Design a protein around this motif. Structure first.
Motif, PDB file in Angstrom:
ATOM      1  N   UNK A  96       5.599   7.852 -11.655  1.00  0.00           N
ATOM      2  CA  UNK A  96       5.223   8.643 -12.824  1.00  0.00           C
ATOM      3  C   UNK A  96       5.569   7.909 -14.116  1.00  0.00           C
ATOM      4  N   UNK A  97       6.743   7.278 -14.156  1.00  0.00           N
ATOM      5  CA  UNK A  97       7.202   6.599 -15.365  1.00  0.00           C
ATOM      6  C   UNK A  97       6.351   5.380 -15.686  1.00  0.00           C
ATOM      7  N   UNK A  98       5.962   4.615 -14.667  1.00  0.00           N
ATOM      8  CA  UNK A  98       5.106   3.456 -14.913  1.00  0.00           C
ATOM      9  C   UNK A  98       3.641   3.830 -14.999  1.00  0.00           C
ATOM     10  N   UNK A  99       3.307   5.090 -14.726  1.00  0.00           N
ATOM     11  CA  UNK A  99       1.942   5.609 -14.823  1.00  0.00           C
ATOM     12  C   UNK A  99       1.000   4.964 -13.807  1.00  0.00           C
ATOM     13  N   UNK A 100       1.481   4.857 -12.568  1.00  0.00           N
ATOM     14  CA  UNK A 100       0.732   4.313 -11.443  1.00  0.00           C
ATOM     15  C   UNK A 100       0.409   5.367 -10.386  1.00  0.00           C
TER      16      UNK A 100
ATOM     17  N   UNK B  95       0.827  -1.198   0.000  1.00  0.00           N
ATOM     18  CA  UNK B  95       0.000   0.000   0.000  1.00  0.00           C
ATOM     19  C   UNK B  95       0.864   1.251   0.000  1.00  0.00           C
ATOM     20  N   UNK B  96       0.407   2.262  -0.733  1.00  0.00           N
ATOM     21  CA  UNK B  96       1.004   3.579  -0.664  1.00  0.00           C
ATOM     22  C   UNK B  96       0.598   4.241   0.648  1.00  0.00           C
ATOM     23  N   UNK B  97       1.243   5.352   1.020  1.00  0.00           N
ATOM     24  CA  UNK B  97       0.933   5.982   2.307  1.00  0.00           C
ATOM     25  C   UNK B  97      -0.522   6.422   2.377  1.00  0.00           C
ATOM     26  N   UNK B  98      -1.060   6.389   3.595  1.00  0.00           N
ATOM     27  CA  UNK B  98      -2.490   6.609   3.806  1.00  0.00           C
ATOM     28  C   UNK B  98      -2.974   7.952   3.259  1.00  0.00           C
TER      29      UNK B  98
ATOM     30  N   UNK C 129      -6.733   9.679   0.022  1.00  0.00           N
ATOM     31  CA  UNK C 129      -7.664  10.789  -0.038  1.00  0.00           C
ATOM     32  C   UNK C 129      -7.351  11.691  -1.227  1.00  0.00           C
ATOM     33  N   UNK C 130      -6.064  11.937  -1.469  1.00  0.00           N
ATOM     34  CA  UNK C 130      -5.595  12.849  -2.512  1.00  0.00           C
ATOM     35  C   UNK C 130      -4.275  12.304  -3.024  1.00  0.00           C
ATOM     36  N   UNK C 131      -4.212  11.916  -4.297  1.00  0.00           N
ATOM     37  CA  UNK C 131      -3.029  11.225  -4.805  1.00  0.00           C
ATOM     38  C   UNK C 131      -1.801  12.109  -4.914  1.00  0.00           C
TER      39      UNK C 131
ATOM     40  N   UNK D 142      -3.620   3.142  -5.473  1.00  0.00           N
ATOM     41  CA  UNK D 142      -3.479   3.135  -4.020  1.00  0.00           C
ATOM     42  C   UNK D 142      -2.431   2.145  -3.522  1.00  0.00           C
ATOM     43  N   UNK D 143      -1.941   1.261  -4.386  1.00  0.00           N
ATOM     44  CA  UNK D 143      -0.933   0.279  -4.020  1.00  0.00           C
ATOM     45  C   UNK D 143      -0.125  -0.010  -5.267  1.00  0.00           C
ATOM     46  N   UNK D 144       1.012  -0.688  -5.078  1.00  0.00           N
ATOM     47  CA  UNK D 144       1.884  -1.123  -6.163  1.00  0.00           C
ATOM     48  C   UNK D 144       2.318  -2.550  -5.873  1.00  0.00           C
TER      49      UNK D 144
END
Ligand SMILES: [Ca+2]
Ligand SMILES: [Cl-]
Length: 134
Positions: A104-108, A21-24, A28-30, A112-114
């Motif tokens: 940004x390069x992978x366009x993700x 997961x990306x940070x919480x 709410x706002x990417x 909300x997660x990778x």
């Protein structure tokens, strides 16, 4: 092999991937905290100091098909050169990798997660956990 986050700590005996997961604040706002680096943290890396260790780290978009062609992007590597230490057999350490440009390069950037892939190259190593933070 795809591994759940609760499967760590793990021995990295083969290539594995895991959803992180990306940070919480990003839920709410990417673009929250856009002028701070988003950091992948691999914790509790543990191995015998007399064993050379290398593993490589890749990231891909969580929505990519795992049964489809590889869309993974190199993020960094952990390396230890064999040595001895006056009072420790083992090392317990950490690896931190910057993700902001990679996402940004992978366009993700909208996700909300990778998916993080760990690719062992040599040496027995334990991985304690994986997270993303500021
Ligand atoms: Ca996506
Ligand atoms: Cl140590």
């Amino acid at each position: 092999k795809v591994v759940a986050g609760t499967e760590f700590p793990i021995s990295l005996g083969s290539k594995i991937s895991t959803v992180v997961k990306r940070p919480k604040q990003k839920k709410r706002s990417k673009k929250a905290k856009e002028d701070e680096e988003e950091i992948l943290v691999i914790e509790g890396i543990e191995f015998d100091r007399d064993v050379a260790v290398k593993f490589d780290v890749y990231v891909n978009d969580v929505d990519d098909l795992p049964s489809g062609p590889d869309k993974t992007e190199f993020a960094g590597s952990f390396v230890s050169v064999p040595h001895s230490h006056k009072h420790k057999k083992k090392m317990n350490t950490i690896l931190r990798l910057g993700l902001t440009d990679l996402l940004e390069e992978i366009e993700a950037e909208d996700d909300d997660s990778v998916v993080v892939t760990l690719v062992p190259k040599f040496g027995a190593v334990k991985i304690g956990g994986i997270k993303i933070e500021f």
